Amino acid sequence: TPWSGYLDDVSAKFDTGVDNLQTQVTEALDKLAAKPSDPALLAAYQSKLSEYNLYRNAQSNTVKAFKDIDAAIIQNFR
Amino acid sequence: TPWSGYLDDVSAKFDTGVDNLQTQVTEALDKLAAKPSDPALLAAYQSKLSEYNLYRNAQSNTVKAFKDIDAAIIQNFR
Amino acid sequence: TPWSGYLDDVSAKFDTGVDNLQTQVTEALDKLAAKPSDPALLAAYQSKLSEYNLYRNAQSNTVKAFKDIDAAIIQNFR
Amino acid sequence: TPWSGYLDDVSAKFDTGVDNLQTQVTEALDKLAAKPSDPALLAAYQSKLSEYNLYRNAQSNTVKAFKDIDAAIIQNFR
Amino acid sequence: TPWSGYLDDVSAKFDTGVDNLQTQVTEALDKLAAKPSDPALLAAYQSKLSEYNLYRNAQSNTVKAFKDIDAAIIQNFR
Amino acid sequence: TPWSGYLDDVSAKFDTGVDNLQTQVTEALDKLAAKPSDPALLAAYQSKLSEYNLYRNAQSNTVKAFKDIDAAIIQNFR
Amino acid sequence: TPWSGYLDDVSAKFDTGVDNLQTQVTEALDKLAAKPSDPALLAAYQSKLSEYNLYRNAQSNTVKAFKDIDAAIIQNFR
Amino acid sequence: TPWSGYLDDVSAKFDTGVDNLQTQVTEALDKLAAKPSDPALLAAYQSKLSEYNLYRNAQSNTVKAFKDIDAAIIQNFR
Amino acid sequence: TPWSGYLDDVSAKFDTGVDNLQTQVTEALDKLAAKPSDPALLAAYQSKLSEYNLYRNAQSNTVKAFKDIDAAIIQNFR
Amino acid sequence: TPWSGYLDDVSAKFDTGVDNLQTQVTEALDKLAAKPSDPALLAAYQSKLSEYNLYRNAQSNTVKAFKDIDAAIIQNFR
Amino acid sequence: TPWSGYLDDVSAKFDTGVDNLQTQVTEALDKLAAKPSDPALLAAYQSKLSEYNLYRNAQSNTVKAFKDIDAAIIQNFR
Amino acid sequence: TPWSGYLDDVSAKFDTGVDNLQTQVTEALDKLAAKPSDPALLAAYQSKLSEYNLYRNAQSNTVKAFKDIDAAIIQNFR
Amino acid sequence: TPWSGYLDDVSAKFDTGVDNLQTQVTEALDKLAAKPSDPALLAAYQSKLSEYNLYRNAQSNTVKAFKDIDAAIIQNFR
Amino acid sequence: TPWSGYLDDVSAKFDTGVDNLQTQVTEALDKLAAKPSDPALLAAYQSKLSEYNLYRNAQSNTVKAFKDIDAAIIQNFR
Amino acid sequence: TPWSGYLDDVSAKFDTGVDNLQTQVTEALDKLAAKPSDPALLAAYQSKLSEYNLYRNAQSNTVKAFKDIDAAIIQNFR
Amino acid sequence: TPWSGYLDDVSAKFDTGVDNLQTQVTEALDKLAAKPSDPALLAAYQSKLSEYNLYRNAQSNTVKAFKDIDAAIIQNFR
Amino acid sequence: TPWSGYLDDVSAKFDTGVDNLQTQVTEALDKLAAKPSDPALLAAYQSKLSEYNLYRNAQSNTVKAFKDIDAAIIQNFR
Amino acid sequence: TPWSGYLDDVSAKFDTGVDNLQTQVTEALDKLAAKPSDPALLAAYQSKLSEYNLYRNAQSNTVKAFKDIDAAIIQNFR
């Protein structure tokens, strides 16, 4: 088992909270790239890519938020 | 009963002053990680994570403040 | 009763200041999704979704504004 | 009459120098929370919250400034 | 009545000179720990904790200053 | 008399500089809403709403500009 | 004649170096507030407010720079 | 039973006055070393390590204080 | 077996508490350097580099904290 | 006429060398507390409070410097 | 009239040479104990307590110096 | 062989991780500059310049991240 | 000719080592105060004020360094 | 075999108690000097140099402590 | 051959440990000054200047660390 | 010849590294101000003003970088 | 002509060896007290007060050194 | 040939043991005073001035140590 800290666990709550959004965005891009004019495939990939953009920003800004909490505690050790 | 000094009591006034903010931030992260696009869940987790950042900095800077008071008294023992 | 800090109270003044805007936007979307060509339903959902966008940005930028006030006070504890 | 030191008097010159800015910000938030789309209420609360942010930072950085003056005098007692 | 020497009387001029600063800092910490995001409670506890830090350092460096005066007189007894 | 800081005075130079533009936009909307096809009422409300959009943006970006000046001075107090 | 130290003289070289920039920004705001849609008045007030922002930051960061020079010399007195 | 003098008894009043602070600091370091990003483990170890720093300085400066009392009595034997 | 003091043992509790974080950060940098645009590789390396920054600061500020405890005991030997 | 020693005369060369800096800092705080957003009042109080911080540190470190000169002469009386 | 020897007269030249320094230090401590954060009261009490420390050491080391002169004359009586 | 430190090795993992992205962006600019209307050359240079922007920001923010780790360790040497 | 000791000669090696840096900083401030927006005048005054800050700290920490050497030799006279 | 007294034996209990700390600090400096940016080499050399500082102070203050014991016994020979 | 003490040898282990980092930073500045917009020259000079900042701080804090070891041994000579 | 320190020489490597960029930006502004609609003059002044913005930021952040190196060396003189 | 012994002549070699250092320190304090923020006046008064501290300690420890020589000769008269 | 006792020979073993450290510190100060911002000249003068501080303290505390040995032998002549 590889080691995981508290920021790894917070960043993996997002990774397991979405189920296969990393796969669904890759699968919706592959269906759309084969036919980039189907409105059903464009509106599916809009709703997947916009869901993936909010997933990756909420994941990144939460790891950065707890890292700012932790660095201000460690500053008070000395 | 485990031992607790004066800095432990000051750091636990913050811990008991918030009731379950350590739980509410963990619960708001778990609801948000399952669906990181609900504005009701993002604005809830913004108000929880920002409340937890101010909790942990006021807790840390108060234990550091009383430790600076105490170390300047102990310096005058000799 | 769950715990609520000062940022929770500011973020819930917006939540109780609007009455059921979280419901009215959900109800106007459900009426519009069943018939997305009625001008009465589109102009209702325009006025609800634009009112909800300003609600969520004023809520988020006020919790962020008071968190910036508080973090600059806590910085002066040490 | 409760006791007030010199830092309490400096921090209360700011408190009495503003008259009811602690009330005007609370009253402008309550008017804005009931209707967070009036430009007259948003521009009023912008000018109040920004005035309150500068009030609380000038109050905090002045109490910290005189505490740094005093601690360097007390250091020279021994 | 318990015995009090000259250093006890100097250290109790500070204790009675502040009235209930040992209580006001404890009461401002208890109000702040219940809600560590109110700017009125943070700026109150900043002005109390900084006033208590200067109280305890001026008390300690004055007892140490008179103890250095007294030990140099007692050295000249023999 | 209610308290007004420097940002309140700058934001009220715009409020008194326009005379009743908050009223003229409300009155031009009420005339236009009763008959939204008169070109004299549409071209009047275009010139009022565009004048009100520039009023509210110049008011908001000037209060924000002086708040950025003030926060950089207060940062140099400590 | 009121007393002026070296930081007062440095902060007043900026005050006399600009001639009436404190007046020209106040006069350009008063002309702009009466008519916040003239491009000649907006581009004048842009060039004045941006000139005043750089004036107040260069004034503040120079008084802070010499205060950091002086405090490191005074630290070496003891 | 091993021998203990008066400085050993004073240094062991601190050792028995804290109960298992030598263990609690070792246990809080072991929990923190396995995951040095949990704010609950950092704020616990801040309050333990700062409590242990004040314990070891008050223990050391009290044994040194009584040793200075005793050496000045023994000097007067001859 | 090489010699290890108490600061070496504290600094190696962090080294063995993380398992292969020195390797996982090196491996996540090598995967990211080959393709610095994969969001899965950037969000992995964010969570590793931020975990490594908190590891190295908590390790360094704990060795410095115990060195400050020890140097104040050794000062009381003479 | 109250008695004044050599340290009192050195500490009063600073008190009379500044003319009314103890008043100008109190007057600049009172003007700033009534309106803590005027850049002219903030930059005035920055230049006064920074001038007062250097005044009180140069006064304190000079009385401490001559007290260290005098105590080393008095040590050579016996 | 109580009896006073030559060491009493030397120790009372210091007592009458300072006028009410025993009172001025007691009065400056009483003003400072009521408000131990005023820089005017701390810098006054620094200059009084340091003046009193040099007064009591010069008084004690002069009585000890003349007692060493006298004891070496009396040793030559036999 | 020129000297390379640890930041040079981290900044050259990015340089060797991309193979000839510094060349491919230069070659795609040279093809595009000769004919800046081919959609095949614009979409190639979009995908190269955006890949180069993410390469140079991940390279720069990683050298800055390890420099912040190292400077906080070196601060604890003294 | 006024008297100059060894610390005066060391502090005047810095004064004559820079040629007219006390003048060049005063002249660059006077040019900048007349126009605090020229990038050529700001980057000149940055390079002068930063050169003057390093001049005054190296001058002060060298006079303090030799004074610490000398005071430890004079301590061994008795 | 060279001669060794009791202070030589106490100072060599420290020399043999550490095994090759004089070598490990020299070897950690040589690895760090070749690459003074590796966090693994900086945190190793922090833990070695801080361990060597406590070794040399405990060695020096113990030889000085026993020399003070011995010189007070030899004083009582005559 | 010029004389070199132990601090000179420690400060020259850093000087010879880096090979020509004093030259590589000077050469990377000269290439960058001729064209301060090449990302290859900026990212090279970032990695050189950050490597030189860590070199000069680790060199300075190690000479200061051994000087603190040596001065505490020399203090125990008398 | 006027005096120039090391920060002056670094800030003048940028000044001589660009040849007449301070002139070319002034000349491109003068050509553009006479006719602010020529695309050849706008695209020339874009490439000059963006080149001048990167010149002045790389010049300023390098003088600040070496000033941070120097101030940390001078701090270790005492 | 007043009488002067050998300790008076040694203590007046220091008084005439410095020329007007008793005046230059008084004159540098009077210039500094009128403006305690000029770096030229602070660095002048640092170099004067540190020169006066070494003057008064070398004067006092030399009169004490010859008094210890003389008292051991006079002890051998009987 | 001038006369030299045993303390002169011990104090000149240090003077000839360093070769021209009295010159190298004077030469490194003269190079640094001409340009007090070169990191190569500051880190050279740090390593020279710290080497000279340890030279003068080890020289002074060894002459004082042998003078304490000799004065206790001469005391036993009578």
Q: HEC string of L7-37?
A: HHHHHHHHHHHCCCHHHHHHHHHHHHHHCCC
Query: How would DSSP label each residue in Q9-78?
Result: HHHHHHHHHSSSHHHHHHHHHHHHHH-TT-HHHHHHHHHHHHHHHHHHHHHHHHHHHHHHHHHHHHGGG-
Q: How far apart are CA M67 and CA R49, in angstroms?
A: 12
Residues C71 and B54 sit within 8 Å (Cβ to Cβ): yes
Contacts of B16 (CB under 8 A, 6+ apart): E33
CB contact under 8 A, Q49 and J62: yes
Nearest CA in chain I to H34: I17
Do D43 and F60 meet the contact criterion of CB atoms below 8 Å apart? yes
Distance spanning both ends of chain E, measured CA to CA: 33
Torsion angle of C-alpha atoms N45, N47, N48, N52, degrees rounded to 10: 130
Note down the domain range covering A23.
1-78
**Cβ(E44)–Cβ(C73) under 8 Å?**
no
Q: Specify the number of domains making up chain O.
A: 1
Q: Do N36 and O13 touch (CB under 8 A)?
A: no
Given a contact cutoff of 8 angstroms between Cβ atoms, the answer to whether R19 and R10 are in contact is: no
Q: Are K36 and E55 in contact (CB under 8 A)?
A: yes
SS (H, E, C) chain G: CCCCCHHHHHHHHHHHHCCCHHHHHHHHHHHHHHCCCCHHHHHHHHHHHHHHHHHHHHHHHHHHHHHHHHHHHHHHHC
Interface of C with D (CB under 8 A): 10, 13-14, 16-18, 51, 54-55, 58-59, 62, 65, 68-69, 72-73, 76
CB contact under 8 A, P72 and O52: no
For residues P67 and M53, is the Cβ–Cβ distance under 8 A?
yes
Contact G5/M25 with Cβ under 8 angstroms?
A: no
Name the 3-class secondary structure at F78: coil
For F57, counting Cβ atoms within 10 Å of its Cβ (0-12 exposed, 13-18 middle, 19+ buried), the class is exposed
Query: Which amino acid appears at position K6 of this protein?
Result: Y
CB J18 within 8 A of CB G3: yes
Instruction: Tell me the H-state helices in chain C.
Output: 6-17, 21-34, 39-74
Q: What is the CA radius of gyration of chain K?
A: 18
Chains L and D touch (3+ CB pairs under 8 A): no
Residues of J in contact with K43 (CB under 8 A): 11, 56, 59-60, 63
Interface test with P, best of M37, M45, M47 (most P CBs within 10 A): M47
Interface test with C, best of E31, E35, E37 (most C CBs within 10 A): E37
Q: How far is D28 from chain J (nearest CA, A)?
A: 18
**For residues Q9, Q12, Q14 and Q17, what is the CA-based torsion angle, rounded to 10 degrees?**
-110
With CB atoms and an 8 Å threshold, state whether H42 touches A74: yes
CA distance C18 to chain D (A): 6
**Of M49, C58, I73, the residue nearest H58 (C-alpha):** I73
Q: How far apart are CA E1 and CA E8, in angstroms?
A: 13
Task: Give the residue on E whose Cα is nearest the Cα of D59.
Answer: E43
C-alpha C4/C-alpha L27 separation (Å) is 58
Across the interface, of O14, O50, O72, the residue whose CB is closest to N33 is O14
C-alpha distance from K16 to closest chain D C-alpha (Å): 25
Which SS3 state, helix, strand or coil, does residue E18 take? coil
Cα–Cα distance for residue pair P8/P63, rounded to 1 Å: 8
Running DSSP on this structure, what letter comes out for residue F18?
A: S
Name the minimum distance, in Å, from the CA of I77 to any CA of chain H.
8
Contact C66 E39 (CB under 8 A): yes
Quote the CA–CA distance of I50 and L68 in Å, as a whole number: 11
Give the Cα separation of G74 and J62 in Å (integer): 9
Q: What is the rounded distance in angstroms from the CA atom of residue N58 to the CA atom of residue A23?
A: 61
**Quick one: angle between helices P39-74 and P21-34, nearest 10?**
150
**Which approach determined this entry?**
cryo-EM
Residues of D in Cβ contact (< 8 Å) with K36? 5, 70
Q: Is C78 exposed, middle or buried (0-12, 13-18, 19+ CB in 10 A)?
A: middle
Between L5, L67, L77, which is nearest N49 by CB?
A: L77
Nearest CA in chain H to B22: H40
**3-class DSSP string for R9-52:** HHHHHHHHHCCCHHHHHHHHHHHHHHCCCCHHHHHHHHHHHHHH
- Residue F55 token pair: 């009023």
Q: Closest Cα to residue M32, out of H61, A56, G57? A: G57
**Half-sphere exposure of F16 toward its Cβ, with a 13 Å CA cutoff?**
7
Q: Residue B30's CB: how many other CB atoms inside 10 A?
A: 12
Alpha helices by DSSP H, A1-78: 6-17, 21-34, 39-74
Chain Q contact set for G7 (CB, 8 A): 37
Q: Indicate yes or no: CB of J68 within 8 angstroms of CB of Q61.
A: no
Do the Cβ atoms of P11 and M50 come closer than 8 Å? no
Tell me the C-alpha distance between I24 and I30, whole Å: 10
Contacts 24+ apart (CB under 8 A), D26-33: D29/C10, D29/C13, D29/C62, D30/C13, D30/C17, D32/C17, D32/C58, D33/C13, D33/C14, D33/C16, D33/C17
Closest partner residue to E62 among D5, D8, D77, by Cβ? D77
Task: Tell me which residue in K30, K33, K64 faces E76 most closely, judged by beta carbons.
Answer: K64
Looking at residue H2, what DSSP letter applies?
-
What are the chain O neighbours of P48 within 8 Å (beta carbons)? none
Q: To the nearest whole angstrom, how far is the Cα of G15 from the nearest Cα of chain Q?
A: 19
* Residue from J21, J62, J67 to probe the interface with Q (highest Q Cβ count within 10 Å): J62
Question: How far is C-alpha J24 from the geometric centre of its chain's CA atoms?
Answer: 12
| J39-74 helix and D39-74 helix, angle to the nearest 10 degrees | 10
Instruction: Locate the chain J residue with the closest alpha carbon to D20.
Output: J34
- For tokens 């833990």, the residue is N47
Amino acid identity, residue L22? Q
Q: Report the alpha-carbon distance of residue O75 to residue M76 in Å, rounded.
A: 12
CA distance R3 to chain M (A): 20
Query: In chain R, which residues are last before a break of more than 2.5 Å from C to the next N?
Result: none
How far is the C-alpha of Q47 from the C-alpha of Q24, rounded, in Å?
11
What sign does the dihedral H1-H4-H9-H15 (CA atoms) show? negative
